[PDB]
Point group: D2
């Protein structure tokens, strides 16, 4: 008909905080569309200033800052935000929790988390613990429009995603799992391989098409590469809320007790039957 | 919250036709934003081709074409469209009706009519005979979003709009009416005067703020300037559906029987009490 | 060809200041496109914060603030900016000069001035004392693109622009001048009348099509309505740099010595031969 | 400064043809931003109609059409266009040449070729045989802006790109080459692996970061997957003009004599030293 009506949507102080996080994403999206270190600096300040100005925060941890950032008394609220303002088709990642101690909570304590993916469209996956909703940025309105409710990942997919150039450094389980995806012993076709090299792009594909994404421990990086607070926990939260699994290989990512704010952990996530099969290799 | 849902909206074959008219407006809006005779030519062809391709039309009259345009048999449908593809902050104007004879219907036979105004926002006023709805073009979606339902004009306003530089050519009623707006005899303040010089901008302001718009008969143009089929009838239809009045000075515009497709008529329209007061001067 | 190259353009610390003023206009333009008092508040803070952050300013006067705003020592620079952040198809207006005393300079001391007009396109007229250049905002780039260099106004035009609804309050010169535009004594056609009611829209039309714009003294407002620092002086500067004239009726606007920061003055401006003819009526 | 000037750019009837190809890309870009088979159909018709309307074409081959499309006599011109209107972060690919026989020319006869990549930005790589120029679509202007002239690929890169899930079907050379990238025998670090799964995204990364992209012959597809006329030849032309190599494994892609318009061929391309090392494995 070419005609629409619009209706305010609410994820069922946290609202003001998400509002401001989305407002930062909107600004980050416009800066990316018109573009390296400068963008990182700009992204970081947009997020820090909007979150603080929300009057909902007390502690932030940023990928870009050595130490946690304590919100001034006047603007102080009850929430803790861990985020990676520009990661990597690049992205932004964040997790929200209710001192530094307050950002070192297990992922299981997350109250909301999300990621933004800056592609031909800017997409946000968001969850407040009642499932995952996908939104697309409408930059003419400056508003995020709901495109899919309660997104669920496939039980089992047919794509595996990891840097296979690190083969010589793989741990035994990874070597075994990859061998199984290429040479299935049960008569089935081999999995296809995809790896963009930007974690949010790879995680997003994993959510919408199914399969598995891995950045496991290896010989060079025995604790993995990806960061527990503001990369692994938020995507583990999103993927679990969509019915998938996320493991370090030895325990669920959301169960790891953080020991420092820039701690790294291995990450294997995706369709639950693919992750379970990885775990059997471990 | 920064989040919205979208819902398809329907004005309560005509739907396909409005869809295509809106699709032409969308294209015209993009060409205007990036900009004289070339634009006129482009606008006209966008409208003619989209309307024909709708499979809903049989006869078009365009401000830009000497003769009526007969839709090819294959694409033929039941509707007649009279339009001014680029008029004038400029606009597009159209009226829809169910040979040339078929475009020479009294305005009272209109089944749908509308105008688009290309400003900081592109706005469309549309009516299918159940009131006026206002929409704003969202160019990121390529969709028109409902911004106001069942728009009503004020009973009496406080603005009068006409080219007062034609004073020496005014007919007696116009001279008298303008004198009354400047020198009220009842102790009230004088009306303010506004005149953009683009009819859709002036009509739109008249709808949303109230008052009166005039392009009456004068000494130079005893039949007025504005065109009955595709300027005066469509705006008369919109203003009447919003509770205003539109007269030639001697009869309602929608009652004039057209005698040619580019016939001109005088136009006085707006808040009903302002138009009635004009009529008493006649 | 559909292909272009881009080249940085410079008007021949002032550069950083214009950069920031343009960055505020860009933000104001986006807020207007997606829309009353809230917008005013938002516009004002965008301008104040960007200008201060430029490190080029020491004193600002805003239409929206009772008292002048003194830049903090750390961010202090050599320039004074008087502006109307949202005036009124609405606009933004500013003048730059090199305590309050420092914003009370005669318009003749202006070092740069400009206006932005938020229409189907966002247009900026800018001058740094070497003529007027017109730019259009490209919001995809976030950059202002030069569309016309060294804009000149016609010697004499054929449009007059003023609220003729104030006729009963006109001073004698205005009554006489308007009578001459409607009833020329020399056999010529009467001028056309246009008046949008938003000063930047009316001034802009006056620049590009020629003629005259008036907000003179009247019985209700013996000092006019429009504000000397941040409305009349900047547009007088732009129109003079384009070869027109701007008078209060008794002296050039740029020669008036300001006696307070929100002082009003009469404004008559435009094509020089039209303004000179107004002056003879005085 | 926030100010720019624009200047028309020309790649040094072919111009009208590129103009129309770019105009189709512009339309395809807008349809992708607002989004599967429907888009394919829409893309195809946009390209076919714009190219024909250019008055420069006589024969088109489309990925989407079984048979070549012969331009009507009235609109006929001297050029032949082979294109894939929507391939796959997806893309459009085209090659231009000066009956069906006329689209079955060796890639060496190409007079212009290009691809568009629809990401956060819409990018076009274009060459008319004097090197590769990269453009970004400015959708506010509707114009492609030059962002890099005479783009050159690295002599040797450090990324290899192929679906390693097809390992069980690899031919011996591919197995050997991949083994060398993972287990270098010369003490160097292993290459990183990247594979988006959309050929234009993978080719574009290969151009700008260097390394190698492979869709070789395998057991399932002994002639490869990718199509010679409108996928392999155009990207081979672009990569060769940037100083890289493109081979089937047994001969340069641009030297293959086409035997049918939807013929497939193997494709290995990229940095010349990486491609040469692949060839030694063959």
């Amino acid at each position: 008909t070419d005609m629409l009506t619009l209706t305010r949507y609410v994820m069922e102080e946290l609202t003001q905080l998400l509002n401001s996080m989305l407002t930062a994403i909107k600004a980050i999206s416009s800066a990316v569309r018109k573009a390296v270190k400068k963008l990182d600096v700009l992204s970081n300040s947009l997020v820090i200033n909007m979150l603080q100005s929300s009057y909902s925060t007390c502690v932030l941890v940023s990928e870009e800052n050595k130490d946690a950032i304590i919100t001034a008394k006047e603007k102080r609220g009850k929430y803790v935000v861990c985020f990676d303002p520009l990661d990597g088709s690049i992205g932004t990642i964040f997790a929200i929790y209710r001192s530094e101690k307050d950002a070192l909570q297990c992922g299981r304590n997350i109250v909301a988390a999300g990621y933004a993916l800056y592609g031909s469209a800017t997409l946000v996956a968001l969850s407040t613990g009642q499932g995952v909703d996908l939104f697309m940025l409408d930059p003419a309105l400056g508003e995020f429009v709901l495109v899919e409710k309660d997104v669920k990942i496939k039980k089992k997919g047919k794509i595996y995603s990891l840097n296979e150039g690190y083969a010589k450094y793989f741990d035994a389980a990874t070597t075994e799992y990859v061998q199984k995806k290429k040479f299935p012993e049960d008569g089935s076709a081999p999995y296809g391989a995809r790896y963009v090299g930007s974690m949010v792009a790879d995680v997003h594909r994993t959510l919408v098409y199914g399969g598995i994404f891995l950045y496991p421990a290896n010989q060079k990086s025995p604790k993995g590469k990806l960061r527990l607070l503001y990369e692994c926990n938020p995507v583990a939260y999103i993927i679990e809320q969509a019915g998938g699994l996320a493991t370090t290989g030895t325990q669920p990512v959301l169960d790891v007790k953080p020991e420092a704010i820039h701690q790294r952990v291995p990450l294997i996530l995706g369709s639950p039957e693919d992750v379970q099969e990885y775990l059997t290799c471990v």
